Amino acid sequence: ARYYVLDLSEDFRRELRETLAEMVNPVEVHVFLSKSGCETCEDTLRLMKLFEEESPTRNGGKLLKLNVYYRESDSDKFSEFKVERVPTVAFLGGEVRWTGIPAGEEIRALVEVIMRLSEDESGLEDATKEALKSLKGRVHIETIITPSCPYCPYAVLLAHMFAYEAWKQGNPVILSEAVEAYENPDIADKYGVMSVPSIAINGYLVFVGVPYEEDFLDYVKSAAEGRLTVKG
């Protein structure tokens, strides 16, 4: 593709391996692809195979456990994780995912998500964690991004951590999806996205840019209750 430069060099592998060397607990990642009709799937697999390879190995166990699924032979898995589009890179039960290759600047958010899940720590504020525990109502976060986008990683990280925090507390009502615009132009145009990152929640554009955690919590709570709040 023309919108991202996949770096599988030894230099990157070295840098990645060094960061992942600090992983605490193992993390499973689920990659959904299609044998055909998916231009970026091959690259996504190369990228994710690289991540798995560079993750630490402790007692024959790779700290990053890669699972790869194809639309055809893995139909039930797609249904289980509620994956309709490919390529998709998901964690948990699919509540944290990238719909579209997490290349370019997204590598930063992908690494951080892996690290935080590994550390059993979302890194969110206590107030946020407490709110997510009891949050009622489903929340579908779509953070529209592109691989080259410099600030997207921060927005993606935030939404993903919200989904993770809720999920780890046994309240998986949040689906945080990082939607790569080039592979999913319809979603980007559904929200009239002019600049990335842009964030939609429950089918409506909610924020343009990277929001503050505390503010995002308000957006999430309001979305859950089907209400509109001020970016304020």
148 sits near Cl ion (criterion: CB under 5 A): no
Among 23, 50, 64, 71, the residue binding Cl ion under the rule CB under 5 A is: 71
Nearer to Cl ion, 19 or 34 (CB): 34
Site stretch for Cl ion (CB under 5 A), options 17-25, 27-35, 60-68, 175-183: 27-35
Site stretch for Cl ion (CB under 5 A), options 65-73, 143-151, 176-184, 197-205: 65-73
Nearer to Cl ion, 90 or 158 (CB): 90
**Does an H or E element contain 116, and which?**
helix 106-118
85 sits near Cl ion (criterion: CB under 5 A): no
84 sits near Cl ion (criterion: CB under 5 A): no
Site stretch for Cl ion (CB under 5 A), options 32-40, 103-111, 146-154, 175-183: 32-40
CB of 100 to Cl ion, least distance (A): 17
Nearer to Cl ion, 4 or 70 (CB): 70
Is 99 in contact with 85 (CB distance < 8 Å)? yes
189 sits near Cl ion (criterion: CB under 5 A): no
d(CA 174, CA 179) in angstroms, rounded, equals 15
Among 18, 22, 35, 84, the residue binding Cl ion under the rule CB under 5 A is: 35
Among 18, 39, 42, 72, the residue binding Cl ion under the rule CB under 5 A is: 72
45 sits near Cl ion (criterion: CB under 5 A): no
Count of residues in contact with Cl ion, rule CB under 5 A: 5
d(CA 75, CA 69) in angstroms, rounded, equals 8
Residues contacting residue 232 through CB under 8 Å, at least 6 positions apart: 215
Half-sphere exposure of residue 208: CA atoms within 13 angstroms, side-chain side: 6
Q: Which two tokens stand for residue 19?
A: 């960061």
Burial class for 14, CB neighbours closer than 10 Å (0-12, 13-18, 19+) = exposed
CB atoms within 10 A of CB 215: 14
Site stretch for Cl ion (CB under 5 A), options 12-20, 38-46, 62-70, 88-96: 62-70
CB of 99 to Cl ion, least distance (A): 17
Q: Where are the beta strands (DSSP E) in the chain?
A: 27-33, 57-58, 61-62, 64-70, 88-91, 96-99, 139-145, 174-180, 198-201, 204-208
Cis amide bond preceding 150, omega within 30: no
78 sits near Cl ion (criterion: CB under 5 A): no
Q: What is the DSSP letter of 205?
A: E
C-beta nearest to Cl ion: residue: 72
Residues near Cl ion (CB under 5 A) are: 34-35, 70-72
